[PDB]
Symmetry: C3
Subunit: 112 residues, 3 copies
Amino acid sequence: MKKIDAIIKPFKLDDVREALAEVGITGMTVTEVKGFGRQKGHTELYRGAEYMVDFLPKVKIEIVVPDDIVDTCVDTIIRTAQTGKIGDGKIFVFDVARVIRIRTGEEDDAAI
Amino acid sequence: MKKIDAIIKPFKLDDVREALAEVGITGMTVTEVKGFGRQKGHTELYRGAEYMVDFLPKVKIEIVVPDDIVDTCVDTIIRTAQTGKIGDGKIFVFDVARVIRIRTGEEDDAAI
Amino acid sequence: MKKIDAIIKPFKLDDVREALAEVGITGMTVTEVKGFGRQKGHTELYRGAEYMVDFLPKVKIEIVVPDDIVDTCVDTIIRTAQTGKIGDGKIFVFDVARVIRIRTGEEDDAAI
C-alpha cells in the first residue's frame, strides 16, 4: 500500500474527487494549505513586500491505496487536475508501514 | 522511530489527547481537515449536489514516537477514538528517516 | 529525494522562507496547525481546564528536495527558526518513493 499526496489548484478538487470515486476510492482527506512558488506573473518565492502577499491557496489531497492501483490513481489525478499552465502542482507517493482501522482494531495488509 | 497519523472524529480529540499524555507522549500536532467517504446515511463520495456539501470535518493527529511504543500508542488511540460506528477513521504508520531538534541542532536516533 | 517537514513558531515563517529561497528551493507548502506540548510556563499536555485552551498555533512547512541538499536545508531551517527557547519545534525527514509533475505527467528521479 502507498500514500499519495497531491497538491492541486482548488477549483479542480471536485473533478479529481469525482474521477477518483469512479476508480473505486472510498475515502479521501483534504487539507487547505498555502503554496509558495511557481506562479504566473512572478519569478520568485519571497518578494517580501509590505502589503502584497506571496501565497496562493492550494488543496492537498491524501489517499492511501493498494500498490496495484497507484498508477491508475496517479494517471486519473493528472488527467483531471492538469491545466498545462504554471502551478499545476505535484504528486508525491510514500510507502506506508501499517494501516489500522479504528472501528474494529483490524489491520490492512500494508504490503498489498 | 515512527510517525503515526490518525484521522479521527473531532469530538474524540480531548479523550485521545488525555490518554496519549498518560502513556508519556509529550508533543502532538493537530490539523483540521475535510473528510470525504464513509458516512452514516450515505453510500458514496461525490454526490455532486448543488446546495448539499459532501464533506465532514475531521481532525488529523500526528505524533513521532520510538518504535517500542508504537503498539501502545495505536492501542490507546483505538480505545479512546473508537465508537463502533461508520466513520471512525484510520491510523497510518510511517517510517521516519531523521528527527532534528531545532532549538539545539541535535538529532534523535531515528532508529530507536 | 526526501520530504522535509518542519513545525515552527509562526513568526519565523518569513525568515525561514527567505533563507530557503536563497539556497534555491522553488516551492513550499505551508499548513497552519495546532501544537500541543512543550510550552513556557507549562509542564503538561492536557490541563483539561474549562475555559483555558492548551494549544498554540504552529506552522508546518513541507518541501521535497534532492538528497544532496537535505543537510543544507536542515541547517538553514535551524539557523533561521531557532530561538533557543522552549517550543522551537522539530524537523522530520521522510523518504519519497515517487514525485510526479501534474502539468506534464513527467516524473522526477525520486532517488536523486
